[model samples]
Target: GSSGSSGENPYECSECGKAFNRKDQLISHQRTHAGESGPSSG
Candidate 1:
């Protein structure tokens, strides 16, 4: 569930440490770390 608090974006990626306000943003950031389909460093 997205934090309904009226504050700054507190969501962060556990794998990449990227922060976001919406879950969709987090999902997109995660895609960057996907296997061969994105920007996974390892």
Candidate 2:
């Protein structure tokens, strides 16, 4: 098979379209959009 299986990116910023090598990097970088999710879990 010429086309082998490939994996996608680990972490990326939502709405920011930015990819980071580490998970924490995206957290701090896209902090603005973090709190927006599940804000009303209660």
Candidate 3:
């Protein structure tokens, strides 16, 4: 279950247990777990 109220972050990362209020942030974080860099990297 969620650790905070509805307005707070409920989504937790399965790999690190980090939480984010938005799904996009979680998706972006997953990239790190895959050893991938952000789009700006070359």
User: TM-scores for all candidates?
Assistant: 0.53, 0.50, 0.58
Query: Which lDDT value does model 3 have at 2?
Result: 79
lDDT tens string, model 3, 1-42? 477556677677999899998999999998888854567755
> lDDT by residue for model 1 over 1-42, one digit each (tens)?
377656677678888677898988898789878767577677
Local distance difference test scores for all models: 0.79, 0.76, 0.82
lDDT value, residue 15 of candidate 3: 91
Candidate 2: tens digits of C-alpha lDDT, residues 1-42? 346546455998778798887889888888776566565767
* lDDT leaderboard ranking: 3, 1, 2
Q: Name the best candidate (by lDDT).
A: 3
- Looking at candidate 3, the ten consecutive residues that score lowest on lDDT are 33-42
Name the runs in model 2 displaced over 4 angstroms.
1-8, 32-42
Q: By TM-score, who's the top model here?
A: 3
Candidate 1 wrong stretches, greater than 4 Å: 1-7, 36-42
Better of 2 and 3 by lDDT: 3
